[PDB]
Amino acid sequence: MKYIQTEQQIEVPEGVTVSIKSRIVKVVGPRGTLTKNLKHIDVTFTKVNNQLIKVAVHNGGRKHVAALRTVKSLVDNMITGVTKGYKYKMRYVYAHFPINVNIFIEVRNFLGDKKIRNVPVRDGVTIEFSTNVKDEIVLSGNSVEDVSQNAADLQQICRVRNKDIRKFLDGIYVSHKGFIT
Amino acid sequence: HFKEYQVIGRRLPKLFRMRIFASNEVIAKSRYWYFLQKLHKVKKASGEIVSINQINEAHPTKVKNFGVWVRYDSRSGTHNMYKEIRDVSRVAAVETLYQDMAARHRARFRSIHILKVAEIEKTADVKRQYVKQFLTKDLKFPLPHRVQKSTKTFSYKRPSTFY
Amino acid sequence: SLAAISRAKSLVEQVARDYVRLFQCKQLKRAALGRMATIVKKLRDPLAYLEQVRQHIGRLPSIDPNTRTLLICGYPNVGKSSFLR
Amino acid sequence: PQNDYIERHIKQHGKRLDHEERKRKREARESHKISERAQKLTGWKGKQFAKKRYAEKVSMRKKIKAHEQSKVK
Amino acid sequence: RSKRQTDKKGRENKERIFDEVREALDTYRYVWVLHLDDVRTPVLQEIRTSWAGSKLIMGKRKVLQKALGEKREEEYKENLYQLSKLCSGVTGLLFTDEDVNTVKEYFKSYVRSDYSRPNTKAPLTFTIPEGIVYSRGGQIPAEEDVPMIHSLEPTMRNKFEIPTKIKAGKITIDSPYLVVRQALILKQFGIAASEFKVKVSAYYDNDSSTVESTNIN
RNA sequence: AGAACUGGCGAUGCGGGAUGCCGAACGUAGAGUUAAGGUGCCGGAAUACACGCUCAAGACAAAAGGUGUUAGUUCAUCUAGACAGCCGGACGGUGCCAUGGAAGUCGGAACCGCAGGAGUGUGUAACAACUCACCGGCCGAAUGAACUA
RNA sequence: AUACCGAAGCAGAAUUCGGUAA
């Protein structure tokens, strides 16, 4: 089709304010601030009334429209994280070898393995062992990408060593996803 | 640079009439003779071209959404095709169609037949989005990444592409 | 199924012994595969049955007749389920 | 060792907590793997893949035709 | 490129409803416009079996609008545009011959148990026991109640979000969890503590075209 | 693998194709225009203009596939609400053989009362529970299937 | 030439298959 013009709109809650120069995101709100570089996408931002930012692409195509829509998706995710804040919950179980998670995140005694597993804490993500709930860890952070990457790394670096995939139930999984608010 | 000519024939009657687009009258006559065989059974020696006259646009100062029906002989037979083109004159509209066909289908003057060209004076009649997008109310769009033909071999300012 | 597998092996040996015994040479090799496929593909049903029985026979318990053994019989689930437990 | 040892354990403790989500995502990725593989596999791999895809297309067409028959009568 | 035992009804079904409404506009003696709170096939069949002189006609709301007229200047009869505009929500349109006094009583006197609906809090503060869960809910008399199936726990932990876990084939929770998830939780346990009472608005006459607007449940 | 024939060498320069068909057939010289073939450098000539294509090509394999990219053809839906996506209805008689459990969903043989299969899958010993296809609250117009290139 | 991935009713041991690679 080769659309001559295409644009989308981003909702801006009163609690947050944004300013974009040279494709630089500056999301500021009650839960802190976040930034991201979108220069490689070559999209254009346009303010209208300090409450809605237009992201538009001219003479683009499906390849460029995909990046344009991804820009809006990332902006919405950043706004939600700065406002509500994401809370990734992860639960771990053990058939016969307790997983003595300890602090930096460390994992011990997985399937009786002597080796110690650990994943460094990333920026913008916090770790809080679940209270009262048995063998549960609750993660939180304004940046969805960092929290999700930390959860994926924790779930991947601790896996069965090429044994039966059904008999061995030990592991760590994302039990629930929610928001801080 | 094509030109529009009206060519008629009658094999020396019904006075068959059709519109031919060619760069010159000589090519127009040849195309008319070729189309005569397809339309009916006639030969060049049968008669003579009764009259050939170039047709100029009534007013080459108005933008018209030309609707064109074109049949072309592809590598696997001939198929009927219809398209709409936004232009100012029929001569330019047909040339644009020829260039588009040569760019995509690689069909050229040899294997392209022009059936009918008619303007569209009402919106929503054009069913092609690439023309429909230009039929809206006065719009505005930029021209990003503009460039300048630097005659000098060397530059000292690091030119910018802004418009 | 065992008889069918034995017959297939015998036919494979027969085909091999038959061969043991440019334009023209190109077609020499085709017949070997063309007939091996005919011999083999038809055994899918016996092979399917063999595979089906393999899973069931690969988990049989240790029903040792020599060692002293005790059995329980009667109407199902009259408390018998927990007796062995 | 029992007749349903793996099934017994699965029923007694359930499947892997992420098996369903991973399986759904694995099938979603396989949905694009069909096109991804056909544009890179060379030689014997491509030769087999083309024939298998043609067979699947023919089988799918026959299945659709049979389904249409079950609706007529 | 790059895209994602019965057949589609098509325009024929819509025309069928249109013709049925057009015929029933004068076939019956009286008409009512309904706003039933929910759709429930057992209840919608009990409403039919409860009487013989009245029938409930259901269809697409916009299809009913065409049959009754989308504009007052094109209505086939007086107050038909008002009748078409009155219908809303569930496309309930009742036809009856009994007088208004007899018909109105059924709506008030008729009520049946039903599940909750989205955007509505649970009718009661039902709580699952802080231990081994049961199919019926657990908090209900445990003598009849039975432990839940082992294979359904993944759906509960995801669709319902409750922190259920399988232990030796039985689901168990460490806390007494309370009750669209609000309606789904009640639906799964079968706790239909809510009730459904079809409400009606303007009673209509096929000749007088009276608009007896009301709101009896 | 012989073959009845029509243009060309043998005796054939020169320009072009890195080198082996196109142009052109030849005295020694000065001046101007071209054929073939070229105009990013080697290489004498415009990193010339205009319409689209292509992410790895580009100066015998085409039998077939691509959720690779861009255009037209047939049918269908038409603000009586296009397509994607949320919530609900998804019922009744009800079924016989396997009897051990099988009630749509392990396997025998194919109705209809009023938007709904005597049933596309998940799953339980089987009911249970979700479901797609079919509709309804739902959204506000292009869209789904196969072909031509 | 050795190993790294995904699958098998692969409980463990142990075995086979599609890709990387000599």
UniProtKB/Swiss-Prot annotation, chain A:
Name assigned to this protein: Large ribosomal subunit protein uL6A
UniProt source species: Saccharomyces cerevisiae (strain ATCC 204508 / S288c) (Baker's yeast)
Annotated signal sequence range: none
A GO molecular function held by the record: structural constituent of ribosome
TM spans (from-to): none
Sequence similarity: Belongs to the universal ribosomal protein uL6 family.
Entry GO CC: cytosol; cytosolic large ribosomal subunit
Further remarks about this protein from its record: Present with 52400 molecules/cell in log phase SD medium.
UniProtKB/Swiss-Prot annotation, chain B:
Family: Belongs to the eukaryotic ribosomal protein eL20 family.
Function: Component of the ribosome, a large ribonucleoprotein complex responsible for the synthesis of proteins in the cell. The small ribosomal subunit (SSU) binds messenger RNAs (mRNAs) and translates the encoded message by selecting cognate aminoacyl-transfer RNA (tRNA) molecules. The large subunit (LSU) contains the ribosomal catalytic site termed the peptidyl transferase center (PTC), which catalyzes the formation of peptide bonds, thereby polymerizing the amino acids delivered by tRNAs into a polypeptide chain.
Protein name: Large ribosomal subunit protein eL20A
Superkingdom of source: Eukaryota
Annotated InterPro entries: Ribosomal_eL20, Ribosomal_eL20_dom, Ribosomal_eL20_eukaryotes
Annotated keywords: Cytoplasm, Isopeptide bond, Phosphoprotein, Ribonucleoprotein, Ribosomal protein, Ubl conjugation
One of the GO biological process terms: cytoplasmic translation
Molecular function (Gene Ontology), one example: structural constituent of ribosome
SUPFAM superfamilies in alphabetical order: RplX-like
Chain residue numbers at which the record places covalent cross-link Glycyl lysine isopeptide (Lys-Gly) (interchain with G-Cter in ubiquitin): 116, 122, 140
Organism the protein comes from: Saccharomyces cerevisiae (strain ATCC 204508 / S288c)
Signal peptide residues on this chain, from the entry's feature table: none
One GO cellular component term: cytosol
Keyword Oxidoreductase: no
Subcellular location: Cytoplasm
Modified residues (Phosphoserine): 23
Entry-linked Pfam families: Ribosomal_L18A
Additional free-text comment from the UniProt record: Present with 54300 molecules/cell in log phase SD medium.
Gene3D superfamilies assigned: 3.10.20.10
Curated annotation (Swiss-Prot), chain C:
Localization per Swiss-Prot or TrEMBL: Nucleus, Nucleolus
Entry binding sites for GTP: 74-81
Signal peptide: none
Disulfide bonds: none
Function noted in UniProt: Involved in the biogenesis of the 60S ribosomal subunit.
Additional facts recorded: Present with 28000 molecules/cell in log phase SD medium.
Family indicated by similarity: Belongs to the TRAFAC class OBG-HflX-like GTPase superfamily. OBG GTPase family. NOG subfamily.
Subunit (UniProt): Associated with nucleolar and cytoplasmic pre-60S particles. Directly interacts with RLP24.
Name of the protein in question: Nucleolar GTP-binding protein 1
UniProt organism field: Saccharomyces cerevisiae (strain ATCC 204508 / S288c) (Baker's yeast)
Gene designation: NOG1
Entire protein: shown range: 94 to 185 of 647
Curated annotation (Swiss-Prot), chain E:
Name this protein carries in UniProt: Ribosome assembly factor MRT4
GO MF term list: large ribosomal subunit rRNA binding
GO biological process: maturation of SSU-rRNA; nuclear-transcribed mRNA catabolic process; ribosomal large subunit assembly; ribosomal large subunit biogenesis; ribosomal large subunit export from nucleus; rRNA processing
Compartments it resides in: Nucleus, Nucleolus; Cytoplasm
InterPro entries: Mrt4, Ribosomal_uL10, Ribosomal_uL10-like_insert, Ribosomal_uL10-like_insert_sf, Ribosomal_uL10-like_sf, Ribosome_Assembly_uL10
Species in which this protein is naturally found: Saccharomyces cerevisiae (strain ATCC 204508 / S288c)
Similarity-based family: Belongs to the universal ribosomal protein uL10 family.
Keyword DNA damage: no
Chief localisation class: nucleus
Oligomeric form and interacting partners: Associates with the pre-60S ribosomal particle.
Record-level GO cellular component terms: cytoplasm; nucleolus; nucleoplasm; nucleus; preribosome, large subunit precursor; small-subunit processome
Keyword set, alphabetical order: Cytoplasm, Nucleus, Ribosome biogenesis
Note: Present with 18200 molecules/cell in log phase SD medium.
Function statement: Component of the ribosome assembly machinery. Nuclear paralog of the ribosomal protein P0, it binds pre-60S subunits at an early stage of assembly in the nucleolus, and is replaced by P0 in cytoplasmic pre-60S subunits and mature 80S ribosomes.
Record keyword Nucleus present: yes
